[PDB]
Design a protein. Structure first.
Length: 379
């Protein structure tokens, strides 16, 4: 009954955080839990868990650069359109997974997991499960449909699969990220699960901060877009914000915001803060379209505007749904203006719809319940 469970994540905070509730779900159910990730191992440790860094010195941004340089045709074609069918993006996602393989396979041999839980980007997790000979459970991201994505990714890792004597298995269960209404007409892949936001711990101070008298709007762009494309995209958003009669809080995480210089007087900045803690006191949020941020805004019950850098192809899958369900607005960073921010804060139908989608979401099975379901499925 007592298991060793290995959680496997691609080297991204947006990849890793959606595994944390399940990892604490397994730990509080008495199991041993270990995380495999690269680049962000210290953040995983700051969730109170044990971590092995399966690729020391990894840099996602350097991997991205190497892909573009090495695949100029892909870069000038497929990469000029949104990443929707990830089968087409196998070359890029395989480049991301490749450096994690050797370290993950060694870890599987040493740790001997009974179960692998991996996030949807981490084909290396399926390979790990096959190495150990154990079931794999997939945790989905945003609204991407899996289809043949793992076969396409694996087609570029063939050499490594041969060396480690592994084939690509199918997961025994898949767990959706979004609530049913935000998948539109796309067929669900497995179980729905409530989104319980995780963004790190925090000392809030000597008291619980009160909700401000004036409405505050958060501006956040996740953990990879501005790192990969530069901080420039947030400038037109901040300029538009300075023209709006509302207060704004800029939350770009560990990103150095020095290049922005002096912010408008109605815009304040914070360093890394768990997003749900920030949003507890906000009226709306402007962001890039990251799935974790979309879901955390829904947990807060607030309208959202998705305005990524126009070059970023990985923020597309929530956009149609945010639109069609009326819980927010969609644009691009360079097209944000004061009128659009006023719509975000003023259109009551957006807030009504957000609250309705939140009600749907918070009734879904919890991570604790989902741990029980997984254990039943594999027993
Ligand atoms: C801006 O630059 C990018 O976005 N980069 C990339 C991301 C990748 C794959 C995603 S699709 S597989 S999950 C079916 C990538 O494989 C690799 C990597 C390492 C870090 C990263 C991020 C990228 O996605 C991020 O994933 C989050 C889970 C999403 N929220 O749910 C975010 O919306 C999205 O921003 C390749 C990549 O280039
Ligand atoms: C920048 C920032 C992000 N976050 C969280 C919100 C999300 O859970 C996660 C970002 O994931 P996500 O929004 O999926 O996008 P990306 O992969 O593009 O970064 O990081 C914080 O909690 N605090 C912060 O200061
Ligand atoms: Cl959070």
């Amino acid at each position: 009954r007592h298991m060793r469970v290995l959680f496997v994540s691609s080297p991204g905070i947006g990849h890793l955080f959606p595994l944390i509730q399940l990892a604490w779900g397994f730990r509080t159910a008495g199991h041993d839990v270990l995380i495999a990730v690269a680049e962000h191992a210290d953040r995983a440790a700051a969730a109170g868990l044990e971590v092995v860094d399966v690729a020391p010195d990894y840099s996602a941004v350097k991997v991205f650069e190497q892909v573009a340089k090495d695949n100029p045709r892909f870069a000038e074609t497929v990469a000029t359109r949104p990443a929707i069918d990830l089968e087409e993006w196998g070359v890029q996602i395989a480049a991301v997974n490749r450096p994690l393989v050797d370290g993950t396979m060694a870890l599987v041999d040493d740790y001997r997991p009974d179960l692998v839980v991996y996030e949807q980007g981490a084909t290396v997790g399926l390979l790990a499960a096959d190495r150990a000979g154990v079931p794999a459970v997939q945790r989905n991201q945003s609204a991407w449909r899996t289809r043949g994505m793992h076969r396409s990714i694996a087609s570029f890792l063939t050499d490594l699969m041969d060396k480690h004597q592994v084939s690509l298995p199918e997961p025994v269960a898949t767990i959706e990220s979004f609530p049913p209404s935000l998948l539109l007409e796309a067929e669900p892949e497995g179980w729905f699960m409530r989104w319980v936001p995780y963004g790190g711990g925090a000392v809030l101070g000597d008291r619980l901060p009160p909700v401000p008298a004036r409405p505050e709007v958060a501006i956040t762009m996740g953990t990879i877009e501005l790192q990969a494309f530069g901080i420039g995209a947030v400038e037109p958003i901040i300029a538009a914000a300075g023209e709006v009669d509302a207060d704004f809080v800029l939350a770009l995480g560990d990103l150095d915001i020095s290049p922005l210089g002096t912010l408008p007087r109605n815009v304040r900045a914070v360093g890394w803060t768990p997003l749900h803690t920030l949003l507890r006191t906000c009226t709306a949020v402007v962001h890039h379209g990251g799935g974790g941020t979309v879901m955390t805004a829904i947990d807060a019950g607030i309208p959202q505007l998705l305005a990524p850098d126009p070059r970023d192809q990985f923020q597309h899958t929530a956009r149609e749904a945010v639109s069609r369900r009326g819980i927010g607005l969609v644009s691009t960073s360079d097209k944000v203006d004061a009128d659009l921010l006023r719509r975000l804060i003023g259109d009551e139908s957006l807030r009504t719809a957000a609250r309705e989608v939140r009600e749907e979401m918070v009734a879904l099975p919890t991570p604790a319940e989902t741990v029980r379901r997984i254990v039943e499925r594999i027993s």
